[PDB]
Design a protein around this ligand. Structure first.
Ligand SMILES: O=C1Nc2cc(=O)n(Cc3ccccc3)cc2CN1c1cccc(OCc2ccccc2)c1
Length: 1706
């Protein structure tokens, strides 16, 4: 709150812009002499004599400059004078430079030296250069110069393998190192907020012709540099700035502006450094006289040209493309007439080069007229090849007199000897007037006088008007001061910075102005900028003036609603109009106009008028002279121009229409105006489109999008779409149009019929081709009801057309529009990008759409091309048969009970777990307390995450221990992480203090059964408890449990939810058989339908407590921030600053958790938060302890970056970190030492920590399998929001959710409101049905139908039938659908040979079904095994086969991982045949080969390898079973060897010594071979700790002896049973489990005793066991005849290599 004054900006602004002079006088050098010709005044400024070298100045040969930089300098012997003074500064220092030189001084090679300096850092090994490690930006003021420089730098840097490209005219430019472009282009790019995607890699910025600061375009430069500098401060990344300027006053302020050290990087060269000394002639015209003004100019021109009439070149600059033809024509038109003036400057009156200029005449246009006589023309466009030919022919210095336009001076380098500029008057469309030419143009033009290698002295002449034009004299003689035009453009600039989020308020804006050139200029010339010496003395830093300017601009932006700004706080709030305004580069008055006139019902007439009213056009007016032509155009343009007579408005309208109709024009001012309106047209219309699209106005969205496309394609909607193909003849198309036939119908005609219909058969084939090149999409929909208000839509987009790289490029963009029945409203919309490589792949787009209870017949889904005209597909979505679900019952009302005390629990040993922490239970806990603690009946508690639902389950547990001391309780959590957290908490709370037994179920079965036996409290995930309790008939400990607790039961609606549902239903089923109730306690998030889950689990209406999300003990303040960006990387980057703003606004001093999509995003967001904080001049602001205190803990960290961020008070959490590291970060965060932690989404279940503020960065994650982004499960988000809960510390929790705009409303709905859930079990049926058939719970079809009655599914099917695709809620429909389900499931199971179906009723388990059910493996997996396995299968084939298991289907493919898997593919022993690298099976294969080969990989691949190796064993054992069941010897035992070598990480053929720890590839050389051989270990390297590991290895590794007998050798014979008895004994007590350090989940040894014939390759008998101490093994098999043959007895492990044994017998 500081005093603010409203300024009048029009008072402070410089009106003349570039034409403005701070100059009082102008001092003329040496000979000033004036010659008065009475028709004009002539002022001569002579050339400066060439300066002799100074004492230290010398030329610097290319050999002297650095080795790596010599390339690109071929063609240049040594450096230029200027460049020689600059070479050390450019190449050998990183200092910011400002180079002031005469125009044409060759400042270019200096910039190239700066570039080469940047390149020199990247030298690398023998990679030659690093293309992707850096980017360089070259900003040039003119487009022509941009292309010239792209060419030059391209040629010069070609040897370094570097791409130079032009950005000004859409992504893909990401592959380009040097981006050349205009200030406004780069400003537009860096405004986007995803700017960082471009600028993160930028190490260098070169501002060319920076004196443009004085020009009206200058503020753009100021904004650019300000933005970049603040970015140097904010990112801490150093970015070098090189300014290049003409020699003019104030340049030192430019150096300051650019952060240049005046004693280091500032270089100024006066006019004596001009490469060709210039004799200057300044002509000016006395009076305004009529039309003889022009004849005066031409008379001047003639007299001054003729002084050169032998070898000399003259270049004349004129202001119109017509004036080129008129002036070159005019001297030949004038002159000659008098004694053939200057005739034959064609050298020899014969044919020297005359034959060459007369031979090129066979060119076109007016070129042919002037060319035989040394003459030519250069003007803007309309020539082609001819412009080039004028250039090359003028270049060999034959064309003598060349008349041109400034575009030549800017576009290509061809200096002449003499340069004449005519009149200095140019038409300005934006001013709508005729004004005096821009300073930059004059400089670059006159800069062409004299030829560097061909001229000792140059000459130039500037003809102009007399008055107040001493200005030019000021300009060329280095006296014209550079000022700041910033005051003019201040509101649009300020708005841009507000939209980027760089200024959040007035103070930030003042500080922002501090970086502007305006600031310095105001400081050093205060009177000029309208500041009193008094004001300046009292306020040297100009706080008052900056604050006042900011105040005025803010009021302007606030008026037009680009920004909400309150004068009290001074804070800025971005609006959408401002956001679009900054993005689409529109002035604030125009956005306000649009805001006024835009409405859904706006007609097209009205639209064109609104476009005409854009303030970009405010100075355009209708001249008398153009009226007639306008009239003609209006008669020819299609859209009615409403009641506007010839106003500026109507003129603009018709000019745009005329541009679309491609009508040719004559009037030149009119042509200029049209170009001006059409350049802006696309942007303005795209802006309008964005406005109405995001307001959801369907008609106007349609109109506006079409208008964008029409301006782009220069055609009306009415015409034929084929026009959009540019290589097609236009009269063919007009013939097609003349036929009043639909374009669509052309799809169904063969090319014969095509050529036939058009009576032009010759084109018939080609047309056909293009017809099928036209983008076309097929649309398929799948509709699932969610709530009465909400529907789920799966939209399948199928491309139908041929892709062409020429036509479609790399991609094609579409808008998915979901509109209501009237097509007046867009209910949902999103951007869909079809990539070329991924075309022909099917695209599944999922979203939700709102509906309203008086349901319409249908909605409409239109997919419309973003570019192509008349490209669309519309699909009706029919509601006729739609059955909305039942509305949700009210939540259980939360009563305010007295906050029941801990003493209400009556036990002391119980109360001691609580009283220390809290005096009382919360309202939810007290309300449910009586029910849960006192009764035994089943109970459901719904409540938001963080309501403390946990200790209700704990009430129940305490009661179970109260009733029976030996009682057994099983607790299930969907997530393993949660399971371990609960395990820690309750191990302390029960096993330690209350001294009960607390166990945690693991992967392995046997040890788990044991844990089930001893445990009082048993913690498990659904899968473990599933593979356990499947055998429940046979396992008593499963049958008897007093208490069953399920937490987060709403996860039944998520992935893996079917298993939760199955085990819960099985527990209910079990409960009814023993008529001893198994109590069931279910905890959940607020459910829209509690009632269904309650009926399912046996909860009474009173024992069911389901609470609304607003009763959450810590009240939630939820804020949802939409971002409209369709490209995720860009969105994240645009989210970076809003995150920091969220921290500092909502939780400045209190803890903050920030969830981000991926591992890498954790580090990046942490670093952004860090550096931004520090750039607020507040560092450690997030560190609430002293750095000194942290050092002792941080000494234990391996990770460097984690140390640095923790040191700044910000930690982060991802899976790559060690448990120690994670625990460290969590402990520090909980303690309050660090205020901020940034965790990946995968850890949201695995974090025990809480915050005051939770920020969710984006909502989506990348799926590499489908090549698309997918939404966070609503469950993960619920969890994340729950992590901001702090009942003790905070009076409120706070959450800020950041997301793509299309998702925004979704989170406003299902966060605030309770969550509807459904059962996906019906798609998971097969494994469970197979399982229950094996255990004989299901013996027939009726048993399956009955089994289904225990599921949540059964309940939901009548509540939301259409979700499960039931067409009715009648009991008939239910029975029918269920029967259909069991029939299909059982059928699929029979076809897979898992089960056998008998008598159409009964079912029985088969072998494969038993195998799958036993090892807990998907049935398709073992089916696949049975199909792909044969007698000749070996190890490699086995790996390929096991890699294809369905268990590995969910192995993730991450972003940009295809390259890494491609690299891994060549590094592995078994090359894979035609692999797809987004295929998870290919990945698991490669990773298996990697694990075997001891390849260490990236962290991600390592975690993946872990998840694979997890399920590897059961898969392999399944292969063993299957192989033996088919009677194959060789493939078996190979499977076993594979099990071994998977456990111990070794290959087929390999050292057995590789199993011992602390062995490398170097050691084996001296080992020349068995753990059995281990005479002094002194053979090689030993450490006593390493000695401990090896000695520990050998006392475990099996030492086993085996006896065998064929019982009664002789009494067995012909046909009868044979029993081979084997006896196993080991000479050591087994200690510890298997040790396989490289195996993630340590397994226990098991052994196969196999009997088989090695000749016929038959496995006659097999058995698997665990040894214990010693073991008896009975192998029984049937005998062949003539009883005596040769057999083999194998003894194999699943773990170790080398323990394998063979015994031959008979
Ligand atoms: O962002 C999203 N994430 C999700 C996560 C998730 O788990 N599910 C499954 C699920 C959801 C709730 C309960 C249980 C299971 C679904 C989504 C869908 N979703 C989304 C995406 C695009 C658009 C959209 O508009 C919705 C909308 C718009 C306007 C008015 C009303 C609604 C929504």
């Amino acid at each position: 709150l500081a005093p603010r004054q409203v300024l009048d900006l029009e008072d402070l602004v410089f009106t003349q812009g570039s034409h403005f002079m701070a100059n009082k006088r102008c001092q003329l050098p040496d000979g000033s002499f004036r010659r008065q010709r009475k028709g004009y005044e002539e002022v001569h400024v002579p050339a400066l004599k060439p300066k002799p070298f100074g004492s230290e100045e010398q030329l610097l040969p290319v050999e002297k400059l650095p080795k790596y930089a010599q390339a690109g300098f071929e063609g240049f012997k040594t450096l230029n004078r200027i460049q020689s003074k600059l070479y050390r500064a450019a190449l050998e220092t990183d200092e910011n430079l400002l180079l002031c030189a005469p125009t044409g001084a060759g400042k270019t090679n200096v910039a190239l030296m700066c570039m080469l300096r940047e390149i020199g850092k990247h030298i690398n090994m023998d990679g030659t250069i690093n293309v992707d490690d850096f980017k360089i930006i070259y900003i040039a003021p003119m487009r022509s110069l941009v292309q010239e420089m792209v060419g030059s730098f391209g040629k010069r840097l070609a040897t370094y393998g570097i791409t130079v490209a032009e950005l000004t005219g859409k992504e893909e430019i990401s592959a380009t190192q040097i981006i050349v472009c205009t200030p406004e282009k780069w400003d537009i790019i860096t405004r986007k907020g995803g700017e960082r995607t471009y600028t993160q890699l930028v190490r260098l910025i070169i501002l060319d012709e920076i004196h443009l600061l004085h020009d009206d375009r200058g503020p753009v430069l100021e904004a650019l540099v300000a933005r970049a500098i603040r970015n140097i401060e904010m990112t801490q990344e150093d970015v070098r700035l090189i300014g290049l300027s003409a020699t003019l006053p104030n340049y030192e302020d430019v150096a300051t502006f650019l952060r240049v050290d005046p004693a280091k990087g500032l270089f100024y060269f006066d006019n004596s450094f001009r490469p060709v000394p210039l004799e200057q002639t300044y002509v000016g015209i006395t009076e305004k006289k009529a039309i003889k003004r022009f004849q005066i100019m031409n008379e001047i021109v003639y007299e001054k040209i003729m002084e050169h009439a032998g070898k000399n070149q003259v270049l004349v600059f004129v202001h119109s493309r017509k004036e080129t033809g008129k002036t070159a024509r005019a001297i030949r038109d004038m002159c000659l007439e008098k004694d053939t003036l200057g005739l034959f400057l064609r050298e020899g009156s014969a044919s020297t080069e005359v034959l060459r200029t007369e031979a090129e005449q066979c060119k076109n246009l007016e070129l042919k007229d002037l060319l035989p006589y040394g003459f030519a023309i250069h003007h803007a466009g309309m020539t082609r090849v001819d412009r080039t030919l004028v250039e090359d022919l003028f270049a060999d210095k034959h064309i003598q007199v060349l008349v041109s336009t400034a575009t030549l001076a800017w576009g290509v380098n061809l200096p002449a000897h003499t340069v004449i500029i005519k009149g200095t008057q140019v038409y300005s469309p934006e001013k709508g007037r005729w004004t005096e030419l821009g300073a930059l143009d004059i400089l670059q033009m006159l800069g062409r006088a004299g030829r560097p290698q061909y001229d000792t002295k140059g000459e130039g002449i500037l003809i102009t008007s007399h008055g107040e034009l001493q200005y030019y004299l000021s300009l060329l003689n280095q006296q014209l001061p550079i000022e700041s035009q910033m005051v003019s453009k201040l509101p649009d600039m300020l708005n841009a910075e507000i939209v980027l989020g760089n200024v959040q308020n007035a103070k930030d804006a003042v500080n922002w102005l501090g970086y502007a050139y305006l600031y310095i200029r105001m400081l050093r010339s205060p009177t000029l900028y309208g500041i009193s010496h008094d004001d300046l003395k009292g306020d040297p830093l100009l706080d008052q003036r900056r604050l006042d300017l900011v105040h005025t601009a803010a009021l302007m932006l606030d008026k037009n609603n680009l920004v909400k700004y309150d004068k009290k706080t001074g804070n800025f709030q971005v609006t959408e109009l401002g956001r679009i305004a900054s993005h689409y580069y529109i002035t604030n008055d125009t956005v306000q106009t649009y805001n006024q006139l835009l409405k859904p019902t706006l007609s097209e007439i009205e639209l064109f008028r609104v476009f005409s009213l854009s303030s970009e056009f405010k100075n355009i007016t209708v001249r008398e002279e153009e009226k007639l032509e306008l009239q003609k155009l209006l008669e020819r343009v299609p859209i009615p121009v409403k009641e506007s007579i010839e106003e500026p408005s109507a003129k603009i309208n018709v000019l745009l229409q005329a541009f679309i109709s491609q009508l040719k024009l004559e009037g030149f001012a009119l042509m200029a105006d049209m170009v001006y309106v059409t350049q802006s047209a696309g942007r303005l219309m795209r802006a309008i489109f964005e406005i109405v699209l995001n307001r959801g106005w369907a008609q106007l969205t349609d109109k506006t999008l079409n208008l964008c496309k029409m301006i782009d394609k220069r055609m009306w909607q009415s015409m034929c779409p084929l026009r959009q193909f540019r290589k097609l003849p236009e009269e063919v198309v007009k013939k097609i149009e003349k036929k009043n036939f639909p374009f669509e119908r052309l799809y169904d005609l063969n090319h014969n019929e095509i050529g036939e219909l058009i009576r032009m058969p010759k084109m018939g084939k080609t047309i056909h081709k293009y017809v099928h090149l036209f983008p076309k999409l097929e649309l398929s929909v799948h509709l699932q009801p969610i709530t009465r208000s909400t529907l789920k839509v799966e939209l399948t987009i199928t491309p139908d057309f041929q892709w062409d790289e020429k036509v479609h490029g790399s991609s094609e963009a579409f808008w998915i529009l979901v509109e209501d029945v009237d097509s007046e409203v867009i209910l949902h919309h999103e951007y869909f990008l079809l990539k070329a490589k991924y075309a022909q792949d099917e695209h599944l787009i999922t979203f939700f759409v709102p509906v309203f209870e008086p349901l319409p017949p249908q909605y409409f889904i239109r997919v419309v091309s973003d570019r192509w005209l008349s490209c669309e597909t519309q699909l009706p979505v029919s509601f006729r048969h739609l059955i909305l679900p039942e509305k949700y019952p009210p939540p259980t009302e939360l009563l305010d009970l007295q906050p029941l005390p801990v003493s209400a629990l009556r036990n002391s040993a119980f109360e001691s777990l609580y009283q220390d922490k809290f005096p009382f239970f919360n309202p939810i806990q007290t309300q449910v307390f009586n029910t849960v603690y006192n009764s035994d009946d089943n109970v459901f508690v719904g409540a938001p995450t963080g309501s403390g639902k946990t200790i209700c389950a704990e009430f129940a547990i305490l009661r179970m221990l109260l009733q029976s001391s030996e009682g057994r309780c099983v607790y299930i959590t969907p997530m393993e992480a949660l399971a371990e957290q609960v395990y820690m908490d309750w191990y302390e709370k029960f096993q330690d203090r209350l001294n009960k037994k607390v166990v945690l179920l693991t992967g392995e079965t046997s040890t788990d059964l044991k844990l089930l036996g001893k445990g009082n409290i048993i913690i498990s995930t659904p899968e473990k408890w599933d593979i356990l309790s499947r055998r429940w008939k046979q396992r008593k400990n499963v049958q008897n449990i007093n208490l069953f607790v399920v937490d987060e039961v709403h996860l039944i609606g998520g992935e893996n939810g079917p298993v939760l549902e199955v085990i819960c239903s099985r527990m209910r089923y079990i409960s009814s058989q023993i008529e001893r109730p198994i109590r069931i306690v279910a905890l959940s998030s607020s459910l829209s339908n509690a009632k269904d889950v309650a009926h399912w689990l046996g909860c009474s209406a009173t024992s069911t407590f389901n609470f609304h999300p607003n009763v959450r003990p810590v009240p939630l303040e939820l804020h949802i921030q939409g971002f409209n960006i369709s490209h995720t990387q860009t969105r994240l980057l645009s989210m970076a600053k809003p995150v920091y703003h969220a921290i500092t606004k909502h939780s400045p001093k209190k803890p903050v958790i920030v969830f981000v999509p991926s591992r890498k995003q954790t580090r990046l967001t942490a670093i952004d938060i860090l550096t931004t904080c520090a750039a607020d001049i507040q560092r450690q602001r997030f560190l609430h302890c002293t750095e000194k205190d942290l050092i002792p803990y941080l000494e234990k960290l391996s990770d460097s970056t984690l140390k640095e961020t923790l040191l700044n008070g910000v930690g982060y959490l991802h899976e790559g970190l060690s448990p120690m590291e994670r625990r460290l970060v969590e402990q520090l965060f909980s303690s309050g030492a660090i205020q901020v932690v940034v965790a990946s989404r995968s850890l949201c279940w695995g974090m025990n920590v809480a915050a005051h503020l939770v920020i969710i960065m984006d909502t989506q994650y990348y799926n590499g399998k489908i090549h698309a982004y997918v939404d966070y499960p609503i469950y993960d988000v619920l969890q994340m929001v729950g992590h901001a809960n702090r009942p003790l510390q905070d009076d409120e929790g706070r959450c800020v959710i950041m997301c793509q705009g299309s998702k925004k409303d979704f989170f406003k709905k299902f966060l605030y409101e309770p969550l509807p859930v459904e059962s996906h079990l019906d798609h998971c049926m097969h494994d469970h049905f197979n399982a229950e058939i094996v255990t004989k719970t299901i013996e027939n079809k009726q048993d399956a139908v009955d089994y289904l009655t225990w599921t949540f599914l059964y309940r939901r099917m009548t509540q939301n039938p259409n979700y499960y695709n039931l067409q009715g809620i009648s009991h008939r429909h239910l029975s029918d659908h269920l029967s259909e389900l069991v029939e299909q499931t059982l059928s699929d199971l029979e076809q897979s040979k898992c089960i056998s179906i008998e008598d159409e009723m009964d079912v029985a388990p088969l072998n494969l079904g038993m195998i799958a059910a036993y090892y807990y493996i998907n049935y398709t997996t073992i089916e696949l095994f049975s199909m792909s396995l044969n007698a000749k299968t070996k190890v490699r084939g086995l790996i390929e086969i096991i890699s294809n298991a369905a268990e590995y289907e969910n192995i993730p493919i991450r972003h940009h991982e295809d390259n890494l898997l491609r690299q891994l593919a060549q590094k592995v022993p078994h090359k894979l045949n035609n692999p797809k690298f987004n295929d998870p099976h290919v990945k698991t294969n490669l990773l298996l080969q990697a694990h075997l080969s001891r390849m260490q990989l990236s962290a991600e691949l390592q975690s993946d390898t872990e998840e694979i190796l997890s399920k590897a064993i059961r898969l392999i054992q399944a292969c063993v079973d299957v192989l033996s069941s088919n009677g194959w010897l060789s493939p078996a035992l190979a499977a076993m060897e594979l099990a071994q070598m998977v456990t111990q990480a070794m290959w087929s053929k390999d050292s057995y010594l590789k199993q011992l720890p602390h062995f490398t590839s170097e050691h084996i050389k001296r080992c020349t071979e068995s753990v059995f051989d281990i005479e002094r270990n002194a053979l090689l390297q030993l450490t006593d700790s390493q000695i401990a590991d090896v000695a520990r290895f050998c006392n475990r590794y099996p030492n086993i002896e085996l006896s065998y007998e064929v019982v009664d050798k002789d009494s067995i014979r012909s046909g009868g049973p044979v029993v081979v008895l084997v006896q196993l004994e080991r000479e050591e007590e087994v200690t510890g489990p298997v040790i396989a350090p490289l195996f993630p989940q340590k397994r226990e040894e098991g052994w196969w005793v196999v009997i088989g014939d090695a000749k016929s390759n038959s496995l006659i008998s097999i058995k698997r066991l665990t040894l214990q101490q010693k073991a008896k093994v009975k192998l029984d098999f049937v005998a062949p005849a003539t009883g005596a043959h040769n057999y083999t007895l194998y003894f194999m492990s699943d773990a170790y290599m080398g323990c394998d044994q063979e015994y031959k017998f008979s």
